[PDB]
Copies of this chain bind each other. A is one copy, B any other.
Amino acid sequence: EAGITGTWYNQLGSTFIVTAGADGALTGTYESAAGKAESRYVLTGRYDSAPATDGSGTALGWTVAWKNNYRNAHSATTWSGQYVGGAEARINTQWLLTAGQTEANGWASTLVGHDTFTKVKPS
């Protein structure tokens, strides 16, 4: 009933596969079409399992650490956003991507951006 479980695609062509559990959990895999990434990475997150009923979206977030058996990019992305249902359902997000840095370079550790996920792929 949450509308979230399934496969989602962003504007870069990345693939977000997620299960929204009854307890508020998000689990799944992420495959990025961009950056220092190859194949699937574990993700986990949380969502509001009792959202408002006034047309507001459903708040959520998740994390990927960019380490798997094929690569380690010494970094992690978190996406914070909301699911907005309907015939053209979307998950609208903004993200923070932190790379490990020495203390001297810590000020320059974190990229910010935004991803829009839909249930069908962009062309």
Contacts and interface: CB of A to CB of B under 8 A. Distances in A.
Interface of A: 12, 23-26, 34-35, 42-52, 54-67, 72, 74-82, 84, 92-103, 106-114
Contacts of A94: 96, 98, 110, 112-114
B42 A46 contact: yes
A92 B114 CA distance: 11
Contacts of A108: 34-35, 111, 113
Given A44-B46, A52-B74, A59 B102 contact: no
B42 A43 contact: no
A121 B95 CA distance: 27
24 contacts: A34-B108, A44-B44, A47-B76, A48-B72, A48-B74, A48-B100, A49-B65, A51-B74, A52-B100, A56-B100, A57-B103, A58-B100, A59-B100, A60-B76, A61-B76, A62-B63, A63-B80, A76-B80, A78-B96, A80-B110, A92-B106, A94-B114, A95-B96, A96-B112
A80 B82 contact: no
